[PDB]
Every structure is written in structure tokens, then in C-alpha cells.
Amino acid sequence: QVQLQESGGGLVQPGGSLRLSCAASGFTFSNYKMNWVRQAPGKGLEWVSDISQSGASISYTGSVKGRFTISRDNAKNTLYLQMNSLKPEDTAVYYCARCPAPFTRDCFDVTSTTYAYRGQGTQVTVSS
Amino acid sequence: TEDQRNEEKAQREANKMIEKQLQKDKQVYRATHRLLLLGADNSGKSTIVKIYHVNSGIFETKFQVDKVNFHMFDVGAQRDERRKWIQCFNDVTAIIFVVDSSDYNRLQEALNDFKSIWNNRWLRTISVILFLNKQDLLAEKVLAGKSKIEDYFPEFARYTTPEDATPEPGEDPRVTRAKYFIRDEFLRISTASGDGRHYCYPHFTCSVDTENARRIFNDCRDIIQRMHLRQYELL
Amino acid sequence: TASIAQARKLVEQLKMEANIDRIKVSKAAADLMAYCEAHAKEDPLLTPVPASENPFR
Amino acid sequence: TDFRYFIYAVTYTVILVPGLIGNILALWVFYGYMKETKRAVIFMINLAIADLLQVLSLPLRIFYYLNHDWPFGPGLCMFCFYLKYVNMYASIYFLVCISVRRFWFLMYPFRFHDCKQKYDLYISIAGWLIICLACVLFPLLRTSTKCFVDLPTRNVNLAQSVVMMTIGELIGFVTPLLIVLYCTWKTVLSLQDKYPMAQDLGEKQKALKMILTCAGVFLICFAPYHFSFPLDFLVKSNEIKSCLARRVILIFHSVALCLASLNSCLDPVIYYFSTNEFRRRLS
Amino acid sequence: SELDQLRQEAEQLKNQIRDARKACADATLSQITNNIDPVGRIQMRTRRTLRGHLAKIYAMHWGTDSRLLVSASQDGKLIIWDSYTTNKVHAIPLRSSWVMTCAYAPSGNYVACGGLDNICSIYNLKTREGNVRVSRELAGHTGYLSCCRFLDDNQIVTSSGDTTCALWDIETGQQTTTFTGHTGDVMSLSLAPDTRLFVSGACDASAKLWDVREGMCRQTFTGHESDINAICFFPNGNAFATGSDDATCRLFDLRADQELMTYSHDNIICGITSVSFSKSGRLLLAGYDDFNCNVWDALKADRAGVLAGHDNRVSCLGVTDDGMAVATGSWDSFLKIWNGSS
Ligand SMILES: CC(C)CCC[C@@H](C)[C@H]1CC[C@H]2[C@@H]3CC=C4C[C@@H](O)CC[C@]4(C)[C@H]3CC[C@]12C
Ligand SMILES: CC(C)CCC[C@@H](C)[C@H]1CC[C@H]2[C@@H]3CC=C4C[C@@H](O)CC[C@]4(C)[C@H]3CC[C@]12C
């Protein structure tokens, strides 16, 4: 069974640093592109960053570019998101989303209302 | 087997009647070009082309340009997950993609939608006609200065207007600087993959713009012509 | 308010699935192997029929 | 006279090897292409077959020039002599068919569907039948151990000869030439976009150079032959009766006829092996 | 705070089920079927090629007489073929051309189809007027129709992209039972031979066993890592096979309530579109995105053969009720009939 467990997060003062961890199970982690998705209160889900199967290709949203770093450990089957210099606008529930199919460059429905291959999410709060 | 002998002839005669009807339907099927209309709700995709019909949960738009029939399909009554029924449109002539240029908050989501559709394994051979709709709202937003594009896209700080840009007469340099920035964001994804099997056709359109039907016709003419050069190399 | 209602249904479903009787895999594997053996001769794809008996000559 | 025997023997041997290799391999790829994608290559196949038969008429013809004797009987000579020219104008017919077809889907892309290829088999069949009928004059007009170049020409009136020559030139060369030039001219324009695409990868540019090359080989090969064929026929009938012109025209027509024979082997390079589809099939 | 509490109780129940399945996993199907001899190399030739569709084929279904079949194309036509003669018996023009599924009634008097129009249309093949007409349009689904199967002339089960399956009463046009519980688009369903149960595969990488009469999910089968695109009951009804986008086929057992065998190869990296069993169940035929159809040994997980006769995606395949032949449909708009020779 495909399951993703987001760990880390909590209450952090603005300008602080925070690291998120995503534990993958039930699938070959090295064969899938991984994504980070967040949902701000009162707003829909939005895509934050993605990392390719081998880690060569990495993308970010312009609102978090230069402050968020995404990394993966295929051997450890774990996904990481380093969040330094946080801002109160980053207070959201962060989700670890897997692309639906392996060995693909596209990633269609990770930022969807009801996505099967997305974890329960972790709460990140930055407001002082 | 005399009774059975004429039974096969009756079945064979009915087969020819079906084949005659199929040939008539084949002529109509290949004389009509099917287009997939995509875009978010904030985009004005429903008013791009100035005969409209609603068949089941699919909004069908049929228009004729220079005696060529185009049948544009819009899919409304489906869930937000579209990674399965998008394969039904793997043999369309082109994909019509409409983006709200003035909407900076949802502009990144439109790029992500374009990136997935462009890189989809069953859409690698389909060209995309890109309509950067609502240009008048984009001009007002840039001139007002209340919202800054560099807030959402840091690359805009060190971006310069392309030398090939053709701004309209009497246009603010700031507006056309940002107008072509959004276009290059979609062309960066377009030119980073495909391997020549498909291309993107960016256009600048407004709410009051009656030439969008002509632009689709011109682009699909180049799409079909490029398709002919590939699959009809050996006549 | 929705989420809590969906959570109750998912938990209730898992209770029904956890109370079923499960046989051993060896017993289930043997039954599948037995069925294939019994019907092997009447499988045209497994054992192709003579051309005289093939409707698709 | 002596040179013409040697010129034909040397040239036909040069074309003999690539013509067989070029056309037989192309037909094998054509059969695989039809089995895989189920798309018609009728014009490409007919062109390859027409060129293949023209090359197959050389080994018997090469034997004559290397031995100065034809022990195979007058019946076979009138077929091998007829076989080369009936396939030369057959190749010309399907070079126009390719030219018109390319003009059709590049100048009117929307008026060319898959079903628009109807009545295409009726074109190749009609093309062969009329050509195989109209080209019967080649052995008929020279029927009078001598074969091919040594065949005497029938005593035909000069007035009647000109009428046949005029008709043959108009429907054999002049009509194919204008259509090929006209189709190539407008196809080049349609492949030139007013606003070029930045990431086009030169897809249309390669087609533009390929189509110009296709029309260039057509003009280089067949035009010199048809500018000497009316003159060479008068030499056979001794109408000119000029010692200086007799030697020049026969040698000039010998080069032109050999140059026109090069189209048997140049067509696979220009048309078949220049296509990226062929490279995929080979590799 | 209650939502967090129920989330942990679900994990405890999932661990209880996982431990229960592991408890009865005394042996492996591979170990049990190691001694039996392999089926050898399976060579099948294309006996018939069905030509006529102008667009990619999306579905096919054999009739119970093992001679007539109905195939659905994306050009808007339903065609019924006489497979023995390749004659077209009917050509039904569809109101909506985006059809995704088709079904042949076991009686042979009706056919069903449906796609992006969210409607299951029933067509009467035996009318006094001599033409095929629409007899029923089953409305009520809020997503595309992915699969449909007749139970009889009056009942049909449909799966939709709105994550639900429905049982319909054709005479009244109303869905008597709705099967809910999938969190993704349901892509396929297969009926048990006794038509008392049916399994469905969805895009949540799970297969659920449903009771037709009771209307609830009896068992849930997990193991796939991607969307499930195909599902087929074993001929005895005690097992089923699935095909997913993760390039794997898995054989699940109903009574053991767990996966028994995986059918995958390192060369295979493409998704699976269709699966079916031979009459004895010894052969599992699966269609792939690489334009090939691989015949697997169900018991030994060996690739018995390959059906390579299509130039585009293999979208569907099916085996006749008598097991005499297998038909494969493809996006290249052609249908082919396969069987072996002595
Ligand atoms: C060697 C000599 C005889 C070649 C003569 C070339 C001319 C007469 C032949 C060769 C190719 C033929 C064309 C082939 C295809 C078409 C398209 C069809 O919709 C109209 C007829 C048309 C346009 C034919 C007209 C006649 C045609 C142009
Ligand atoms: C006097 C003789 C040598 C003239 C040449 C006749 C023969 C070789 C020519 C004339 C008509 C030609 C055929 C015309 C049409 C077709 C259909 C095409 O799908 C395959 C090639 C094929 C079958 C050609 C084969 C070669 C052919 C039969």
C-alpha cells in the first residue's frame, strides 16, 4: 500500500529555519518524481517544489525560490525540504506528493483536491 | 448447404452497405479538425472564439474558417484529477491553452498545468496553441504598480525585452517588458522538450478580440503542414 | 467538519475487512493449480486444436 | 561510332551496381513500411520498380557492347531495347506524381485527408498502360546480329517524323518539366514562413532544400537528353547529311543518354535514402 | 482532536489486517508451482484483421456465442463484427464520440457503451424496424464511464471516474445500488462467473471486492504502486488479476485476501492497459503501452509469448468464452484475432 508520512514542522518564529521529512513506503522510491505541496488557510493547494528521480532536476515556486531546498535519499526512501528564513506567509499544511506513474517527466494531479498518492500532511506555523 | 450458402451472401451484402456508410462518415471525420480547449476558470476560454452546443458534460464549439470545419471540445463535468481522460484527446489536431496573464497569483499554477500537458507521454506529438488572454487587465495592473511581478517571479528583476519583440504602437515599455516575460515562461518549457514532434504557438489576445478564430486556423494550418512533412515523406 | 465524517466511515470499513476468514496461501495456491490442471486439455490457447477444428483457419 | 560503343559499356556498368542495390533495398523497406504503418507508398514503389527494370535491362545490353554480337535472336533485342525506354518515361511519370502530391499537401494542407488518396491506384495503372502503349514506337520505328545502337532506322518521311517527335517531346518532357517546375516553385513558397519559428529546428528548411534538389536532378538529367533526341533521330535518318555535325550530335546524345540513365541510381539517393524514415528502418 | 484519534485507530486496524495476511502466508505460489512443467513457448498468429474504425479503439467485448464481438472506437461508431468472416453485422453511430467502454449482453440482444459523456447507453439489436436504436440512457454518474458489464437483460454494473460504481435497473433507468469507497477514478471492473460478486480497480492503487446484492465492499486488495487500469476474474471466481501503470501484474486471492504472485520484467517499464485469462486460467494475457501483448504463465510467472501485431497502444483485449481465440484492440484502429496452431 502506497503511504507517505510527513514529519517535522510546528511553531517557528519568523526568520527561523525548519526541516521537513517525508517517509515513503509501499513503492520503489527511486522510480518516482516527488513533489512538495502546501495549502494555506483559506486557499487551495499549491505546488512548491519537485525533484527528479535521480535528483538532477530541481524546481521551485518563485515565492520560495532561494529559501527552500528539496532533497531526496533513494537509499533511505526519504524526502527532505529545508526551509530557512521563513515568513508568516509560509504558514500552511505541507504535503508530500508523489507523481502518479514511474519513469515519467509529467506530473499531473499532485496538486488536486483528492489525490491518492499524497500524504496526510504536516502543519507548519510561522506567525509569532 | 444451399440454404447456408445464401445466408453468407446476405451477410456479405449487408457488410457492403455498412462499408458505404463508413466511407461517407470517413470523409466527414477527416474534414473536421478537433481541438481540445484547456485553461483554468479565471481564464476566458469560453469566449475565445466569437455554433455553440452543450452535449452531455462537454461544451462543443463548432466554427468554420475558410471552408474548414473546426470542432473545439471543452470538458466541464469531470473531477480535478484529469490524468486518465486526457488520453482521449491524444489524436486532436491541436490543444488550445488559455492563460490569465493578469492573474499573478495563479500564473505559476498555469505554468505547472502547461508543463504536465506538454510533457505527457500521450501528448508529446500534439502542438499547443497558447492564448495569453486578458492583456488589457495585464496592462492596467502593470501601469498601476500596486502588484509587482518580481514578487512572484524573482527572474523578472534581471529580464530584458527580447530583440524580436513587436510591441503594439503606443504601448508602455514596462507593459511589453512584462507581456513578453510571461510568454517566455511558457516557451522555456516548450523548448526544453518535445524533440521537434510538437511546438507551441503563443498569442496575445484580449476579451474584445475577434481574430482568435483566424489565429487558430493559421496555426493549425502550420501544424497540419508540419505533420504532412513527417508522415508523408514516402509518398 | 467533513473530514471527521469520512474518518468514521474508513474506520468502520476496516472493521468489516478485519473480521473475514482467511485460508492459508498454500491452500489457495493449490486450488488455483488444481483448476488449471483439470481444465488444461479443454484450453485451446494452451493446447492448440487441430486446424480442422479451428474456426479461424 | 567506336566511342559510343565504349561510352555506353563503361557508363552502364557504373550504374549497374548502385541501381540494383538502391532499388532492391528500397523495395524491401517499402514492404516493411506498408506492413508497419499501413500507409501507401504507391508512388515511391512504382518509381523504384520502374528504375529497377531499367537497370535490369543493362546486363543484357552491356553484353552486346563487350562482344559486338547478339546471338539471342531479334525477338529478345526488340524487348530489351524497348524495356529501357518504357521505364525511363515511366520514372518520369512517377517523378511528376511525387511532385504533384508534395505540392498538394504542402500548398493545401486542409484539402488532403487520408481518404483523399482515393483513385491513386487508378493513376499508376493508367500511367503504365498508356506509357507501355505509346513507347512501342521505339522498337517499331527501328524494325527495318545488329542490336540496340546498330539497329537501322525505318525509312520514315521527314514531315511525319517531325510530328511524332513534336508530340513525344511535348507529352514526354515539356509537360513533365513545367508541372515539376510549377509544383516546386509554389511548394518552396509555402515552406517559407513569413515569421520563422525560433525553435523550428529547420524542419521546413531541410524540406525546401530537398525539394529543390529533387527538381534540380530532374532538370540536370532529362533535359539534355530531350535537347538531343530530336537531333539524334535526324542523324539516324541521314537528314542532316553533314560530316561535322554527324560526329558531334551522336557523341553529345551518347553523353545525354548516359546522363539520363544516371537517374536510375540517383533517385534512391535523392528520394529514398534522404528520408529520415529510411534511416529508422535501416537502423 | 477526534480526527487525529481516528487516524491512529485506522493504522492499528491496518496493522491488524497486515499481520493477519502475513500469518496465513505460510508458503508462496511460486514454491507451490515450481514442480509443474512450463507451458513452453506460446506462438499465436493473426488469423483475422478487423478494419473499419477511423479512430483509436478503446474497448471490445466478445459475445457469449464466441463468434460476435462489439468494438468501440473514438470516432463515434460502435461496430459489431462476425469474427469468423470479418463481416460487419452492425455499425451504431454514437451521439458522443468520446466513448471509453463497451459491453455485449450475455443474451446478445443488447449492447452498452459510454465515455466522457457520463452516460451508459443501451442499444437494442433485435428490433422489428431493422435498425439499432437507443433503448436507455443511464444518467446519474458525475464522471466519465470507464467500464460497464451486463448481469442480464435488465441489470448492468457501471464504473465511473467519480470514484463510484453503480448497479442499474435498465427498465426503470435508476441505479438500484451505489458502490462507494474508492478514493480514485475507477478504471475497470470484472464480474464473477456466478454474477454474485464483482471486483473493481481504481486509481488509488487498490482493488475492492463488492457484493452485488448487499451493496458493500467485502474485501480490499492492495499491493500496486500506481493506478490500476485493468482487472479480470479467474475462471473459477476465487482469484483475480490486475494491471497497473507500474508495469506489473499481480494475482490476488479472494479467500487468502492477499497477493499471490507478481508478473513483471525488468525490460517492461510501460503501463498495462488490459488483462484476461485463458479458459483454464493457466495463461494470463496482458496488453502494454509498448504496442505488445505479453502472455504470462499465471502459476509460474513466466512470459510464455508475445503478441506483436500493433503499431500503437494496445487499449483492450479479450478471450472468447470457449477459449478458442483472443482478440486484441489497439489505438491504431485495428482489431486482430489470435490463436495457436498444432
Ligand atoms: C510522363 C508524362 C506523361 C507525365 C504527365 C504528367 C501529368 C499528365 C499527370 C502525372 C500526375 C497526374 C496527376 C496526379 C494526381 C492528380 C490529383 C487528382 O485529384 C487530379 C488529377 C491529378 C492532378 C493528375 C493530373 C495528371 C497528372 C499531372
Ligand atoms: C511491360 C512491363 C515490363 C511493364 C511493367 C509492368 C509491371 C512491372 C508494372 C506495371 C503496373 C505496376 C503495378 C502498379 C500498381 C501496383 C500496386 C502497388 O501497391 C504495388 C506495386 C504495383 C503492383 C505495381 C507493380 C509493377 C507493375 C505491375
CSV table of C-alpha atoms in Angstrom, one decimal, chain B residues 26-27 30-31 33 68 70 191 195-196 199-201 217 220-222 224-226 228-235, chain D residues 33 39-42 44 98 101-102 105-107 109-110 112-115 117 190-191 197 199-200 203-204 275-276:
chain,number,residue,atom,x,y,z
B,26,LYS,CA,-14.8,8.9,-43.1
B,27,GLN,CA,-15.0,11.9,-45.4
B,30,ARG,CA,-11.3,13.7,-41.7
B,31,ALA,CA,-12.7,17.0,-43.0
B,33,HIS,CA,-10.4,19.2,-37.1
B,68,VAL,CA,-12.5,24.4,-43.0
B,70,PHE,CA,-13.1,23.1,-36.6
B,191,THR,CA,11.7,24.5,-25.9
B,195,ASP,CA,12.4,16.9,-29.8
B,196,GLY,CA,10.6,18.6,-32.6
B,199,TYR,CA,5.7,23.2,-31.0
B,200,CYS,CA,3.9,26.0,-29.1
B,201,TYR,CA,2.2,28.9,-30.7
B,217,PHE,CA,-6.8,28.5,-38.4
B,220,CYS,CA,-3.4,24.6,-37.3
B,221,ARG,CA,-2.5,25.1,-41.0
B,222,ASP,CA,1.2,25.1,-40.0
B,224,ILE,CA,-1.0,20.0,-40.3
B,225,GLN,CA,1.6,21.1,-42.9
B,226,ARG,CA,4.4,20.1,-40.5
B,228,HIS,CA,2.4,16.1,-43.6
B,229,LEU,CA,6.1,16.6,-44.0
B,230,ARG,CA,6.7,13.9,-41.3
B,231,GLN,CA,4.2,11.2,-42.1
B,232,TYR,CA,4.1,11.7,-45.9
B,233,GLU,CA,7.9,11.6,-46.5
B,234,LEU,CA,7.4,8.5,-48.6
B,235,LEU,CA,4.5,9.1,-51.0
D,33,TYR,CA,6.8,0.3,-44.2
D,39,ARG,CA,0.3,3.9,-45.3
D,40,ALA,CA,0.5,4.0,-49.0
D,41,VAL,CA,3.9,4.3,-50.8
D,42,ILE,CA,2.4,3.6,-54.2
D,44,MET,CA,7.6,5.5,-54.3
D,98,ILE,CA,5.5,12.7,-56.4
D,101,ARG,CA,1.5,15.0,-54.5
D,102,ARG,CA,4.0,17.0,-52.5
D,105,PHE,CA,-0.4,18.6,-49.1
D,106,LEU,CA,2.1,21.5,-48.7
D,107,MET,CA,0.1,24.2,-50.6
D,109,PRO,CA,-2.8,21.1,-46.2
D,110,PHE,CA,-6.5,21.2,-45.2
D,112,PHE,CA,-5.6,16.5,-48.3
D,113,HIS,CA,-7.0,13.8,-45.9
D,114,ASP,CA,-6.3,10.1,-45.7
D,115,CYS,CA,-9.3,9.4,-47.9
D,117,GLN,CA,-5.7,9.2,-51.6
D,190,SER,CA,4.6,27.5,-49.0
D,191,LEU,CA,7.6,26.2,-47.0
D,197,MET,CA,9.9,29.9,-35.5
D,199,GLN,CA,13.0,26.6,-32.2
D,200,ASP,CA,11.9,25.3,-35.6
D,203,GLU,CA,12.3,21.2,-40.4
D,204,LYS,CA,10.9,23.2,-43.3
D,275,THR,CA,14.4,10.5,-45.9
D,276,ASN,CA,14.8,10.1,-42.1
